[PDB]
Amino acid sequence: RIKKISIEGNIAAGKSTFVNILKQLSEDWEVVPEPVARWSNQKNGGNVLQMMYEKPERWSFTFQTYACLSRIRAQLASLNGKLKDAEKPVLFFERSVYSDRYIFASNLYESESMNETEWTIYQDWHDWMNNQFQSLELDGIIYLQATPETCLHRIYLRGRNEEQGIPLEYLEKLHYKHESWLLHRTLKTNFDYLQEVPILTLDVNEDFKDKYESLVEKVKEFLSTL
């Protein structure tokens, strides 16, 4: 019954900003915040992130596993309780277990922070988790598209250190992974329904926090197409 739409975007692209604004506009509009963000600054979540920063080749499996499990737990609790009640309920997933795997876990394998066996076991469990703990299927995706330069700027326009603004080439790689997944629909996934799911792309390069009506108009009619 409850509508489910994940917000996607590269690091610091403006998802939390967008999702916090989106939730304020309707009592029908509810959100599930991303577990990774806020693990920075429960105890298990602080630890893995720091070690993962300190040494990605040791903790990427452990981290990627606990993050996807945290997201699933979170997304069930606001589904099996929160808002509805509501007349036309929509639940905005701040990121998803698809970008958990096909963006972040995948990048870590590709910079050799997980070896082949970590990454196959991860990819196996992923299926088994999504298949057992089913009704998480998205009806739409909203992609907040931005240039890697904008995100580089926005990481700086936030709070750098502790997190820091990493390489621009690291942002380009996640950019091209986001573009290849959401803009071009070429990434092949085990979850067949994804090819048959609507995507709203949003050029978020221009600043929006005090001027976002045009973005919400696009979101409201995208919602109407569902």
Add this chain to the structure above:
Amino acid sequence: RIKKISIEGNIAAGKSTFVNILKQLSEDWEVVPEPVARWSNLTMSQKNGGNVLQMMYEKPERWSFTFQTYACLSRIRAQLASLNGKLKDAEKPVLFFERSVYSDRYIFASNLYESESMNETEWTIYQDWHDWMNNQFGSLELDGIIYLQATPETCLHRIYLRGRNEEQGIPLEYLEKLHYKHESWLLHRTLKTNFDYLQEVPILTLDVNEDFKDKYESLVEKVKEFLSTL
């Protein structure tokens, strides 16, 4: 309708012998062997288990979390497939599980945490991964437990007897630790778990010290005695 019964015991107790004896006796009895015994000797599962088995023997404080999480998932999958994917049919259906999600957690994992092969974060993560899942999925709760009790010396003797290498045995001291953990769970019942039907689950304890390959009738009789009380 299916009875779910675990076969537990120290390493080289003869769990795998015993379960392979019980499967030959009754049409209503079936076996779910150790996913982890098929990783000693083409299905990425075996490719992955094969690889995480050796890495673990080569570096336990690097690999304990990954091995333990993988073993438990594989066992959960094997229990789910055997169960609602078998013979029923059957008059008095019984499924023996060779070990359980519970030896995985309170024998092996806990032992690895006590030995610094997992840090606090890992052990805590493992535990809420195990807590969450065996409540979400797990049908696999048990109608009973059978306790095959041997001494660590019989166990080390039998480790030697089996095959060794990539499975191996070595320390008599380690077997002693595991042997002690099984008593607290299954014989004194002082080991309190995160599962409260388990403080109260019926437990059959079979002394398997003396070889039972050619003399198993009295043990099988007790099992039968035990099942028809469940």
